Amino acid sequence: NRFTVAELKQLVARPDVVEMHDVTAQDPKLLVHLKATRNSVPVPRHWCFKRKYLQGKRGIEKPPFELPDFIKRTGIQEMREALQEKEEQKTMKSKMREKVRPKMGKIDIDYQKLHDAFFKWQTKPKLTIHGDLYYEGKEFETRLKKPGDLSDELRISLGMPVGPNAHKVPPPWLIAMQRYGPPPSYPNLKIPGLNSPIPESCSFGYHA
Amino acid sequence: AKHHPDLIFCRKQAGVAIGRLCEKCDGKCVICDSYVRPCTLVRICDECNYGSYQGRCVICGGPGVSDAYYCKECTIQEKDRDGCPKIVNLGSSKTDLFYE
Amino acid sequence: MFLYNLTLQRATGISFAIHGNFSGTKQQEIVVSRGKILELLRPDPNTGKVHTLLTVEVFGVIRSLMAFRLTGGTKDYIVVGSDSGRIVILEYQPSKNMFEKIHQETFGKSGCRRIVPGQFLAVDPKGRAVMISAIEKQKLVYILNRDAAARLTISSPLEAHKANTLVYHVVGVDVGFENPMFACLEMDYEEADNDPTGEAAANTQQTLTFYELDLGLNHVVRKYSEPLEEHGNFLITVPGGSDGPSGVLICSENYITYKNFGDQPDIRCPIPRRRNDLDDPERGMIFVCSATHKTKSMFFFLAQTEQGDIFKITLETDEDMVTEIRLKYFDTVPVAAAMCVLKTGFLFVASEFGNHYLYQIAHLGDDDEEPEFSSAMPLEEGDTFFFQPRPLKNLVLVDELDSLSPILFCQIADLANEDTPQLYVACGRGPRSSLRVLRHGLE
Amino acid sequence: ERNRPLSDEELDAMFPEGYKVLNDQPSGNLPFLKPDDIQYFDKLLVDVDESTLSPEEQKERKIMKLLLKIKNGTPPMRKAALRQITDKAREFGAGPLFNQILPLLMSPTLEDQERHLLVKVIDRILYKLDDLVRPYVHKILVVIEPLLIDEDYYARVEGREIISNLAKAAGLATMISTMRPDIDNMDEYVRNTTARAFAVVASALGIPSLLPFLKAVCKSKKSWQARHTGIKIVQQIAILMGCAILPHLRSLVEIIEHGLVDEQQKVRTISALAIAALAEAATPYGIESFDSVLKPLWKGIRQHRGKGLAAFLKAIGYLIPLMDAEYANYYTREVMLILIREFQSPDEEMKKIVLKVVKQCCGTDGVEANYIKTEILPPFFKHFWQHRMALDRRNYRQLVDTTVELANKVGAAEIISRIVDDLKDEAEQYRKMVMETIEKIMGNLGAADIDHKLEEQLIDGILYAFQEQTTEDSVMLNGFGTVVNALGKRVKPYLPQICGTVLWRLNNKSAKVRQQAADLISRTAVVMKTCQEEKLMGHLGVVLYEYLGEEYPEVLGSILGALKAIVNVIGMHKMTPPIKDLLPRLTPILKNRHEKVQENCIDLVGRIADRGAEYVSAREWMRICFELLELLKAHKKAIRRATVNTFGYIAKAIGPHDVLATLLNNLKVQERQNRVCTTVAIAIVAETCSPFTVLPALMNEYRVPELNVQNGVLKSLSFLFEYIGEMGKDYIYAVTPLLEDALMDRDLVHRQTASAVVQHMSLGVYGFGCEDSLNHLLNYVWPNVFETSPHVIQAVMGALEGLRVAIGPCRMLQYCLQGLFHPARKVRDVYWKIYNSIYIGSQDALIAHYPRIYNDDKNTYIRYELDYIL
Amino acid sequence: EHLQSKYIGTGHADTTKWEWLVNQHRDSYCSYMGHFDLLNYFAIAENESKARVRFNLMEKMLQPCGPPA
Amino acid sequence: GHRVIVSDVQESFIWVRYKRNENQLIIFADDTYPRWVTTASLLDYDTVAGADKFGNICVVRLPPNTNDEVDEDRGLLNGASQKAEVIMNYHVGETVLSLQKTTLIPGGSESLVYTTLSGGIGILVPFTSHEDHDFFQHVEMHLRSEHPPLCGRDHLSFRSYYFPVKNVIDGDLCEQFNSMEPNKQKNVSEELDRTPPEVSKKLEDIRTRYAF
Amino acid sequence: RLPPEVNRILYIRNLPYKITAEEMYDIFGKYGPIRQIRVGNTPETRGTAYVVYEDIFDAKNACDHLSGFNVCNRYLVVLYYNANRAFQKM
RNA sequence: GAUGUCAUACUUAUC
């Protein structure tokens, strides 16, 4: 009755969306057609787990809150921290005496500054598409580079100052690239000093 | 209501009888149970308002005071186009407190 | 970016059309519904042209609209059902020049679904009830009453739903001072969907069910249900009471069947086709409109087939029963969605594809030299009724209202060497297609 | 137990220091068993000792042991026992559960709370034992039979719900087969209970489902008891279902017309009662279906006399408004003499039937007012206006309704001239009934027919009824207020005579007299402004400002209500008790632990903050805002709704900078109904004032490492978004990273609060071009749909219903795609529920958003109509 | 349970693909019969009028995908 | 110009880049919202306006990155990598069969003229400043609450039937202020702090500048 | 019919220190016979008292008629006796 | 990861 994964992969036009659990369902062809659709969203990976997607980050350290620039540019966070530091030092008698005769004017910063930060200084957040789902390890997987370009961290680790002059700004592996030739995995890669002009292509690489 | 999960509505054919609310639940919605931004009135059925049941509260069931109306979140989500939101049966709500 | 969409030219392709005294005077008025726009025209018999008096935007998809007159009144109210789940009964005010909504009865959700009522809307000839039926498994019946301040009031909608039963059409049978009856061609799809052999879908023809709303019990129940030998397409109610044979005739592919229950037999008559036209190898011909008319002497029906041959049918009946149904090819007309036969000899045909026509009836009846047929004629070997084509001789065209629907392609060009640009578009469907150039200037 | 006397040692041990005086235990931790209940729990005193001697029925003893936690145990222990009995109802079985529940509820030494707990346990075990209690249907029906005929309405409603659940679980054949020998029983009460249970089962399972069985039970001619039980069941079904037997009225009338013709008078009386119930249920209806029932009824009412003639007269009076005008005029002209001849009947039931028929006999045209005032109203005043009619409630309410109908038909002055003599009587019930009749005549008709020779006598009678009150009923004050509202400007030589009696009643030894005087002053507060009386109101306000020292809290709350009514009827800045000397005077009055007095003080504080905010020196409001946090957590549901409005008015008056810090500091209390009220007050302060000024501060409360404070801040943000609605389009980008970070937390309550905030932002900013933030919230809320908590599932369903209306049904169909044919059923059921919710929200929008499906071998699923192009 | 009996076309966890395809075809036929634009497009695509297209859409409502399996 | 906009009848319209040295045509831009568009019209070099057979009309806007240098297997979700976004969508009620951005009157501005199958003709004009667009949105929000339609359907639920509205101002609801009662027009003018002849002139000036 | 939170003993908070035993007996004995009354004589327990009645219904009627009673210039509150709340200082 | 007894905390403007 239930076919294997090989027949379900050979019968469907898109065998990349076929899984091992879809072969024992009530409709393998309908599931293969729905999973390989144009605008379909896949199922989350927490449907087959046993921690209910909330018991993984138990002992991991996390920041309390990430305030934006429009909220931190109003001076309310420092005043709230100062009020929390002043309120933590008061005893029970100082808290009971301030309830009958309170001291008005806690911070009293401004009235139009918050409206200017929420209306004129409004910044759009970093949104995402509807297909990019969320998981437990999505907040920690930030590793997801180009040939001919190097970052500042790799240049600081390797000790290669990036400059417009191509004398020392290419890495010292370019001598082997001049002795042996261009890399066979990238025929369109152009490096200055070998197949590109040195003062023109100051980016130490071009993919043309 | 949304607080008691065992409460069920009538979901019958709503006629022309407007729903009423008591003084303890005045202003609150029938489905969302909210008292902010009313948009449309509630339409009761023919069996829920007949004889002694006319002018009574749909949620509680006592004497009515004001008119019942739904909020904007029920009118925008097409929740007012359903049946009559009249609580007929009362299960595990305002029953054990009277005997204790 | 933020844009704004305005309407330069209004919609001209009318989807529904009705006639009646909406203003309240002795003259009649036509009400057209183009889906999203409702217009009112005055067929003035002095000049013969059509002049629009009011045009409103309903902001939706008007599925059905019907004018009905109350018992003992002069003004006729228009009941309209749209894609939303609310039927609106309104009345035209000649003073304010607007369509004031008298009542709005909500009985379903929005959207053009098969569970939301609004597709079929039938009204009684007396003006006591109104039936709103959906495509399948949903029906409601509202009772209109007259309050002593000359007020039109609506009661609670009754429950007349039947599960696993689709409805193709619905009409209201005439009943003089009696209970209103609604007749619908229902079709049960339970046995056709529960049997996987496929043979159950061939014996699932529609049946005419007439439900009589009981005013004493305040409920709606199915009074009669008679099966039919052919798939009915539309229904046409006949005036009765003190008039004559009250009933509801059913139209089908080369078929017209009078099926008045109780005592009258089902009288079937084939539709007279053309003489030697090569347009139907194996296909039939169904009706598209009814266009009932009564000049206080008898009753007639200006039926229109799929080709456009407008035929005036008259039912010659006995004092209590129906004897035979007679029909004859009256004239040739373009294909229209709904025809409106008004008073003083006027017929307005609103074509869904092309221009609309408004003609004057010059020779009504035409039972002098036309070879008319009858249902009691013993004719065999198919229909055996070959009518000859002829131009318009009984009616003469008076007004021609231009239109652009359907417009499949349009371009803005300045090939006329003018200052303001022009718009070249298309109109019509089939033989009535034409290329139309339009400019901002006046004629 | 709670009223047992204690010794001095037990009283001294329950008090702390610093005060100056001016075997019998079953298996350990089980609660105390009653000495009369040692029969059902007799197997619990010994040890279990499960070692090769433990059958399955001993596990049913555990079903008794949890019952020992259910009858007289702790309420957390009772909740745990109810959860263990509902979660294991299918594993334990309905057999031993019914065999252990049947002698427990049938004990002669039970109580009301134990019977309510047994009914709740039977109703809770009725959902998991479906299609399994069919042999145990009679054992539950014999225990649920006297519950419907009980005196309490809640127990009768619970018995009716249990009977409806049993009829829904056992079907229709088992209920007809079990109640079939229960119709010809010898006991009349058991037969009436079986008829009521059959009527409840017919109301819960449909009228044509039991219509041929009832017709066969009524048409069988073997004994009069079965026909009487069938007629009683038909009468109970007509009295229970009001407008539901209206399509089935002809089939009931055709069965009821066969009765009232035999030699038995009881069957004829039951048939007449069933006909009267069918006429009173569907009215005005059944005119053509009752044409064959009036001809034997008139003959039975004219040929014989007794209980059957009274039942026929009641049926004629119930069916007389259900006929035409000429038929009712012909019926009323031949039944008035029989009603006048039955006025001197010694029976109470016939007099009650005559009083019920007299209200329906004169309700339309045909009956003249002169004949009803000459030959109908003096015998109704001489035969029905007695002292014994005010004792019973059913004999007093029907008499008051008949008096109101006679005042509306004939005239209010002719009834007020005859009902004013009983207002100064020595009976409290008759005076209360006369005051209620006078209030009904003043509310329905009015006081325009009352002349000057009777208004002073009516005012004196109302003053004598109010001054001689012994109970705590508010009927006399409401009647005096209705009489004052009906008088209006005609009570102008009556205000000093009422003020001298109201001021004298405020100084007395009793405590209820001052509260009654304050309630009468509050009820007559609106009649002083319309009668050009400003000095008397200014004197009453200055008296009530000093009369706030009444030691009774019920009198102090009434004085506060009278002061609030005087401040509402007069100007706020033109009161001789001004706001400058009243708002500090009410600041220690707001710290009361009462229910009505604290609510009246909160309403007065809200009115003084909304109308008199410029009468303070901007210092007492900041001190009263700290006392507003202590006004919550009360079981009244009235002060918590006004304290948020008072805090919003204080934030709008003194600026939203001082109350927001107090609302943020009071959010960490770890108590129920104290964090949601502060969040609602903060949302009301953000909605009344500018929402931007409370925008970074609400972003600050999430910065503190606390779960309760973050949940309160999220609830406050969700309530502020729900109160804003269309104004939340500018505050969506500031709440989007907070909603993105709150949905990724491990706590499910914070995720549910973030889903509710996303649902509020979707329902408020729908149709504004903010679909990107809605999609970003839906992409994080989509893994939150697989939760096991019902509250989190309801929050995810609300977020999905908001995103389907905000982002469109196409995005909801794309998010729910490839989940309907999923292999895992736990996700497939949730996907099918989401698809059903999206189809119920928008069914026509799913046609254009439907995916393309290829054609199969035998069937075709490709849409060829939409694939073609011109 | 009751949601599938009250509102047809909702579905459950044990719903097959043929019944869902028949419900989608019935919803598409109801949307084509209700909206005038789809009926006008179907009448301009073929040579038949609006009444013949409505009769063809009403006659195809009974088993639009074929016999079940 | 050096690109192709292949409009598909079921999913959406996909953009493809054409190379000068080679002869391949690889698609690198698509849409995630199903529309089933029949006709299309190009307004700018990035955005493309299309219309569906259901009755709606949308405008697909390209992302600001626009990575077109793609030489050639998974994409984002069974498609391309650069998913486009929508910035405008409005339902008209009739299937729009033709659309063209041009100038119907000399001396005005550019506007999109659309011809549907119901005989109607629509004109979409962009907003010059934000204040006039905010005033038009306030007038539309006042007319949707003060002047309900006669069919009973909501004005906000009419354009948001299939696709939700985004920065689309319904001119038919704003142009009905001159055909209403004078008390309601005076209340709508006092709610917006203007005059009803001034509101009529502000409503007619955009219609006279954008079209006839 | 009575809630289980009510008891025979009732606690009073923020009481005047100048009140005598006769005034407390007259204020507590208005709703029924009072069995015992203990006033605080400590600086940490000043302003609080405990009144225990003989009948449970009389104690409930007294506790329902003492929350917010008019006294000298303090905000006295009447509440039900709790075993876990009275021993909070230990 | 589940079970069965106990404790703590949380949610639904519940009373």
- Which amino acid is it at E18? W
Three-class secondary structure of residue E6 per DSSP: helix
Cβ contact F34:D810 at 8 Å: yes
Distance from CA of G69 to the nearest CA of D (A): 5
Secondary structure element (H or E) that encloses residue A96, with its range: helix A92-97
Q: Please check whether residue A27 touches E, CB under 8 A.
A: yes
CA distance A54 to C433: 66
Interface touch B16/C106, C-beta < 8 Å? no
Question: Rounded to an integer, what distance in angstroms lies between the CA atom of residue C118 and that of residue C130?
Answer: 12
Closest nucleotide (C1' vs CA) to A56 is H1
Amino acid (one-letter) located at C91? E
Distance, Å, B94 CA → H14 C1': 10
Residue of D nearest to F88 (CA): D769
Q: Distances in Å between the alpha carbon of C296 and those of C248, C303, C319, F98?
A: 20, 20, 17, 49
- CB C29, CB C22: distance < 8 Å: yes
- G78 contacts chain D (CB < 8 A): yes
C2, F171 contact by CB (below 8 A): no
D767 vs F32, F34, F164: nearest CB: F164
Write out chain F residues lying below 8 Å of D845, CB-based.
Answer: 161-162
CB pairs under 8 A between E and F: 23
DSSP F89-111: EEE-SS-EEEEEEE-SSTTS--E
Residues of chain F in contact with residue E37, where contact means CB-CB under 8 angstroms, are 53-55, 93-95, 116-118
Domains annotated on chain G, with CATH: 3-82 (3.30.70.330)
Task: Centre a 10 Å sphere on the Cβ of residue D188 and count the other Cβ atoms it contains.
Answer: 13
| Ligand-binding site membership of B57 (annotated) | yes
Chain E positions in Cβ-Cβ contact with residue F55 (cut-off 8 Å)? 35, 37
- Cα dihedral sign, D755-D760-D766-D772: negative
Angstrom distance (rounded) from CA A44 to CA A131 = 11
| Inter-residue contact C42 to C48 (CB < 8 Å) | no
CB contact under 8 A, B99 and G1: yes
Tokens of D519: 């309630």
CATH number for the domain whose boundaries are C3-401: 2.130.10.10
Distance CA D99, CA D133 (A): 12
User: D247 is written with which tokens?
Assistant: 């399509």
Q: How many CB atoms within 10 Å of residue D47?
A: 9
Q: Is the CB of D593 under 7 A from strand H?
A: no
- Taking the C-alpha atoms of residue D681 and residue D651, their distance in angstroms, rounded to an integer, is 10
* Phi-psi map region of D604: left, alpha, beta (phi>0 left; psi -120 to 50 alpha): alpha
For residue C153, give the chain B residue with the closest CA: B16
DSSP state of D46: S
Domain ranges of chain C: 3-401
Q: Is the peptide bond before D284 cis (omega within 30 degrees of 0)?
A: yes
F50 near E CB under 8 A: no
Q: Does B29 carry a binding-site annotation?
A: yes
Interatomic CA distance for residues C75 and C23, integer angstroms: 7
Nucleotide with smallest C1' distance to residue D76 CA? H6
SS percent in chain E: helix, strand, coil, step 5: 60, 0, 40
The DSSP 8-state label assigned to residue D733 in this structure reads T
What is the resolution of the experimental data for this entry, in Å? 5.8
State the angle between helix axes of D512-523 and D553-569 in degrees (0 to 180), rounded to the nearest 10.
10
Cβ-contact C30, C340 below 8 angstroms:
yes
**DSSP letter string over D227-290?**
HHHHHHHHHHHHHH-SSSSSTTHHHHHHHHTTSS-SS-HHHHHHHHHHHHHHHHHSTT--SSTT
Distance CA D179, CA D196 (A): 11
C373-374/C322-332 β-pairing: antiparallel
CB-CB neighbors (< 8 A) of D726 in chain F: 141
Nearest C-alpha in D relative to G78? D593
* C-beta separation of D699 from D665 below 8 A: no
In the 784-823 segment of chain D, residues within 7 Å (Cβ) of strand H are: 791
Task: Tell me if B39 is assigned to a ligand binding site.
Answer: no
Collect all residues with Cβ–Cβ distance below 8 Å to D727 and sequence separation of at least 6: D691, D764
Residue C126, phi-psi category: left (phi > 0), alpha (psi -120 to 50), beta (remainder): alpha
Strand H contacted by D672 CB (< 7 A):
yes
Sorted by sequence, the CB contacts under 8 Å of residue D490 that are 6+ apart come out as D447, D455
The neighbour count for residue D35, using CB atoms within 10 Å, is 8
Cα gap B1→B9, rounded to integer Å: 9
Using CB atoms, which residue from D808, D848, D852 is nearest to F164? D808
AA letter at F29 = A
CA pair distance D659, D649, nearest whole angstrom: 10
Instruction: Identify all chain E residues contacting C63, using CB atoms and an 8 Å cutoff.
Output: 34
Smallest CA–CA separation between D838 and chain E, in Å?
9
CA gap D601, A9 in Å, rounded:
75
Radius of gyration of chain G (CA): 13
The encoded tokens of residue F93 equal: 């009620």
Given an 8 Å threshold on Cβ–Cβ distance, is C3 in contact with F168? yes
Test C136 with E44 for CB contact under 8 angstroms: no
Q: Give dist(CA A25, CA C181) in Å, integer.
A: 51
d(CA A69, nearest CA chain D) in Å: 10
Q: What residue spans define the domains of chain D? A: 29-851
Contact at CB, C104 and F152, closer than 8 angstroms: yes
Partner-chain contact A39 F34, CB within 8 Å: yes
> Straight-line distance from CA D748 to C1' H9, in Å?
13
Indicate if CB(B3) is under 7 A from strand H: yes
Cα–Cα distance, F70 to F64 (Å, whole number): 16
Q: Is omega for the bond preceding E68 within 30 degrees of 0, making it cis? A: no
Give the residue from D358, D334, D333, D332 showing the smallest Cα distance to D345: D358
Cα within 13 Å of Cα(D695), Cβ side: 31
Nearby residues of D437 by Cβ (< 8 Å), 6 or more positions away: D400, D403, D404, D407, D415, D419
Q: Which residue is nearest to nucleotide H2 (CA to C1')?
A: A50
Query: In one letter, which amino acid is D380?
Result: F
* Rounded Cα gap, residues C307 and C331, in angstroms: 12
Method for this entry:
cryo-EM
3-class DSSP state for residue D626? Answer: helix
Q: Is G13 exposed, middle or buried (0-12, 13-18, 19+ CB in 10 A)?
A: middle
| Helix pair D475-487, D452-467: axis angle to 10 deg | 160
- Region of residue G64 (phi > 0: left; psi between -120 and 50: alpha; otherwise: beta): alpha
In 3-state terms, what secondary structure has residue C308? Answer: coil
**Which two three-digit tokens encode residue D151?**
């005196």
CA–C1' gap, C213 and H4, in angstroms: 63
Q: Could you give the CA distance from residue D129 to residue D170 in angstroms, rounded to a whole number?
A: 10
Q: Give the residue among C64, C17, C120, C67 at the shortest CA–CA distance from C340.
A: C17
Phi and psi, residue D517, nearest 5°: -70, -40
List CB contacts of A17: < 8 A, sequence separation 6 or more: A32, A35, A36, F78
Q: Do chains C and B touch (3 or more CB pairs under 8 A)?
A: yes
CB B82 within 7 Å, strand H? no
> CB distance from B3 to chain D under 8 Å?
no
DSSP SS3 for D743: coil
CB–CB of C193 and E59 under 8 A? no
Tell me the backbone φ, ψ of residue D288, rounded to 5 degrees: -75, -25
Task: Give the integer Cα–Cα distance in Å for A46 and A136.
Answer: 9
**CA distances (Å), origin F14, targets D868, F9, F71, F75:** 19, 11, 17, 14
- Contact (Cβ atoms closer than 8 angstroms) between residue C190 and residue C170: no
Backbone region of residue C402 per phi and psi (left: phi > 0; alpha: psi in -120 to 50; beta: other values): beta
Whether D250 has its CB under 8 Å from any CB of chain A: the answer is no
Using DSSP bridges, classify how beta strands F168-170 and C3-9 pair: parallel, antiparallel or unpaired.
parallel
The single residue listed with the structure tokens 């307004």 is: F43
